[PDB]
Amino acid sequence: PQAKYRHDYRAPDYQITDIDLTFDLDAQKTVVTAVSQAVRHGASDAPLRLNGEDLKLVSVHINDEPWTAWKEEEGALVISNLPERFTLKIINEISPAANTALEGLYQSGDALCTQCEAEGFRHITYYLDRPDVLARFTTKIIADKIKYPFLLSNGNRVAQGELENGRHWVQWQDPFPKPCYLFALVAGDFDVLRDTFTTRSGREVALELYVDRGNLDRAPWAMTSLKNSMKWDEERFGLEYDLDIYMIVAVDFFNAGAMENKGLNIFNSKYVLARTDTATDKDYLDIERVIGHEYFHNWTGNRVTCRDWFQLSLKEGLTVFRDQEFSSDLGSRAVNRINNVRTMRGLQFAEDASPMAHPIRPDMVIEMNNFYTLTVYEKGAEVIRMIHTLLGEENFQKGMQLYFERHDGSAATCDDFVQAMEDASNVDLSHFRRWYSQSGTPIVTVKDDYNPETEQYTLTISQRTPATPDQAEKQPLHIPFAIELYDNEGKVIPLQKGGHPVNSVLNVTQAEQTFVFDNVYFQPVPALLCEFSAPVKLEYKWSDQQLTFLMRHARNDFSRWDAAQSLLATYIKLNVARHQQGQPLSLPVHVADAFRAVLLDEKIDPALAAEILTLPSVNEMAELFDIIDPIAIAEVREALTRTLATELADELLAIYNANYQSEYRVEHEDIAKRTLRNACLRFLAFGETHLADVLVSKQFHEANNMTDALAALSAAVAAQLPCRDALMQEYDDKWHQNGLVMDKWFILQATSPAANVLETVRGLLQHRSFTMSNPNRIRSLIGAFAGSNPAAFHAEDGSGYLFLVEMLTDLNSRNPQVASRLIEPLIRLKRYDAKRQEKMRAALEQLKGLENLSGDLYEKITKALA
Ligand SMILES: CC(C)C[C@H](NC(=O)[C@@H](O)[C@H](N)Cc1ccccc1)C(=O)O
Ligand code: NA
Ligand code: NA
Ligand code: NA
Ligand code: NA
Ligand code: NA
Ligand SMILES: [Zn+2]
């Protein structure tokens, strides 16, 4: 399989302006007829090269003439000797029922549905399957009326008929030109929740959610969130929906979470269905997120699309930034920012050090599905956020307005988006463009000095980005670096220099620079890189007392949480070294005290309290070390939890009882209290065992909602409490017919600290609720084991590696995209010790030898073995 390179982009030799599709639908054998109006832009001898994969070609006509001047090659139909404008007609056959990879047209339970992003439409018919080719689609669907009473495609329903033999048909027309990745089709039998939203200028939009029969009672939250998304995008970005109908269909078999197909989003049912006894606060808020996100693509991705797939972040980074703003405006911004920072530092940084490292705009791709990444998404968004930080909201919105004004109806690049922001704002972003083209995490080192003679504070800030596997050359970035200076009472000290105020977002543009501040009337405690103002690693020599001070006094809630993380980091590192020498945990008392103080601050927002009392995950802890010892990290996290539980026992139980809530509400104050209560529970679970067991079984049995019940179950598993087995059995007894709810149970099993966890995981491949044919199940058991039980996955005997190789040997042929998600923990081998490396290298070499090795895995494996 061949790499493609961004620098090789060229305008296509042919365009298609309109396509009329006919599906004669059948699970075994669907016949597709595609009539496309085309225009040659290139030279008369440049043939039309159409992409196609696993298609059975039946005929080819040009202006109704059977065409003889063509040939099929690997992945393509190449057609010669064409006129400048012509109608192309292709008839071909495909087989949805055989599509296990879930790309193109496939079967989800009894339904048929599509997934076309990125290059899945070529699995449906021969086409210019590239997103710079935009066309007006009309879609006629013909099918068995009893099996497929609902037949859906993009746009408006314009025609319909009955036929003999129990068949019917419907035709759809989508008036907005689109790249084919935005094509969708769905056929099946559903319950439909119907509502409307009226836009600020008065357009009434029919809203339709299609769910499996019986699930209508789990749909209203998603409907509500769609309405909230549409409203917010009007209030914040001034953007209105542009069609008269908005459809979402929830399907159980889907590789990703959701898809923004124009006017017909297709969603993994995981991010639609909720009821208070099946879904947690977190599920409610994820559903909010994803509904929002796909909706926001309607403009940032659909009305303006991507010129080529290397520009993916233009839509994903920007649309992530939007879904974060949405969540943040509606919920707690601090909690949003916090969790988003956890993800950047604990997962994205890891990827940006891995063999798969890439800039947010990749320069080289073998399999484009491997680039739907933390980097393109999460770091993409941080890059957009830095633009926001440099421009301020008002110029940023001007920038958005120019972007649309210029590019509505077309396919754009990252550089276009940057240029619009620069032209509207008058802020120069030529240096800043470097963030699109350079991989890896910059490291920013800060040194300070206070001069009591001059009342000056001097910061010397330096930056470097270490080389990455993909890039030997690195250069300085334009880093927005926000600071605040605190005096000894915790008040902010005005930043100024030579009589004049100074913006507190510093422009760190060089390898090294000095900034001098005047009238600093006391030696300051600095808050640095406030709000995570740039996606960088900060190197500064805090004292513990600076950090506890910031925990008490910092103006932004983010800086308080962040300071607590810097406090813990030190002692996490200490205790990992200790663990490797067989020593128990050591923690100075004033650390426990900072946490006690948080527990008892009556004025702190319980949302914030709760995040501070949520210890860094093992993945966040991993990023503190050059070489990861996953066992020591895990055991230290446990011991820290044990220590704090013991030291803060009375306080924890007090706060636990005080945040009791009789009523269950999906409301931000209630969620916050409850998130704090269950954080308290989690520590208590690791205290005195009799009390722990009582508390946890009691919460599980008395919970009136899944959030409280799952937090108990999860604590029973984590702390291996006596009630554990009985509670897990009850959950299975009650919930086994429900895959989505079971996924929770599988994750708990897979991430158990128990000694025989691997053995249990293997057994669960045969569980009544598991199947290898559903990505959700695969991800919830196997993926959670490899990615989220690093202590077991990295067992010194290598049994974790072998187990994954077995699973990937199946998935490489069944569903390579899920395979490629799942291989990721293996391609991190260079972060681990030599002996684990040798075993992971051997596993990868075994996979490299598979017959019919997929491209998706080949790309990752060769990079990892290089
Ligand atoms: C909240 C979102 C970040 C959820 C996310 N979905 C998306 O980004 C959709 O906008 C994507 N356009 C769907 C997608 C994902 C992977 C490969 C091809 C297509 C997902 O993981 O499904
Ligand atoms: Na076109
Ligand atoms: Na899009
Ligand atoms: Na808010
Ligand atoms: Na100093
Ligand atoms: Na920190
Ligand atoms: Zn997206």
JSON list of C-alpha atoms in Angstrom, two decimals, residues 324 424 828:
[
{"chain": "A", "resi": 324, "resn": "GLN", "atom": "CA", "xyz": [-16.03, 22.56, 23.56]},
{"chain": "A", "resi": 424, "resn": "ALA", "atom": "CA", "xyz": [-10.35, 39.96, 9.28]},
{"chain": "A", "resi": 828, "resn": "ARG", "atom": "CA", "xyz": [4.02, 2.70, 22.12]}
]
